[PDB]
């Protein structure tokens with residue numbers, strides 16, 4: 606069986622555009638981080654009460670996510686098809702995918718050496734303990750780390766990694782999308798590119814199964830999203846929380 610058709614002219618171009626959007630929107634040197642509000646790591650050895658009293662890492666991480674949303678918006682805008690949607694649908698998709706794409710894209714800094722996101726330094730190394738000092742609990746953090754490892758062990762080529770993010774953003778089943786049929790047309794073009802790319806480029810491959818595993822990651826992302834969203838909502842009850850955020854974070858996760 607096992608047909609392995611060549612990438613079409615168009616699929617090739619779609620992949621080139623995606624790699625190029627990603628290279629322009631993902632700086633692997635983390636050179637902008639010194640501009641974020643500074644990481645503050647005060648001893649939290651415990652403790653929800655202290656956590657919430659301090660939120661010591663929230664300004665730095667909020668700026669990091671905020672900056673990251675901005676990069677995601679730009680990335681989305683260079684997805685072939687994205688511009689063809691109404692601006693209303695573009696935004697519905699951006700807001701409901703943003704934290705998910707952040708979790709995907711963050712995989713590039715995540716490292717299995719010590720199960721951190723290493724954006725350089727030790728100032729810009731983020732661990733479980735740093736994410737609890739932003740107010741999150743282990744109900745989100747532990748599956749997030751599991752997802753990050755799960756995803757590292759797919760050993761995605763960068764083509765797959767950027768198609769996956771593109772497919773994540775352009776989902777016809779998001780609440781409040783007006784032209785589900787268009788969005789789906791676009792996702793299918795993107796999915797067919799990924800299915801085709803995998804069959805072409807991936808060794809062995811009796812393990813065409815990578816596609817199933819990639820698709821399952823998108824489903825893990827919905828659970829992480831809803832969990833992050835529960836926790837964000839509880840955090841926004843913390844008086845002065847909003848100082849610690851940014852207007853964009855407030856709109857997107859609000």
Ligand SMILES: C=C1/C(=C\C=C2/CCC[C@]3(C)[C@@H]([C@H](C)/C=C4\CC[C@](CC)(C(=O)OC)C4=O)CC[C@@H]23)C[C@@H](O)[C@H](OCCCO)[C@@H]1O
Pocket residue numbers: 630631632633663666667668669670671673676704707708710711712713714715722724731736739740741745749833836837840854
């Ligand atoms: C964000 C990125 C990076 C690390 C991501 C991380 C590490 C820190 C905690 C985060 C952010 C999680 C955490 C559960 C989510 C949080 C914590 C606090 C924040 C603030 C809004 C929150 O809600 O707290 C209440 C939030 O959503 C979700 C993803 C986590 C570095 C780099 O690879 C990229 O960045 C590199 C730029 C290159 O383009 C990428 O874009």
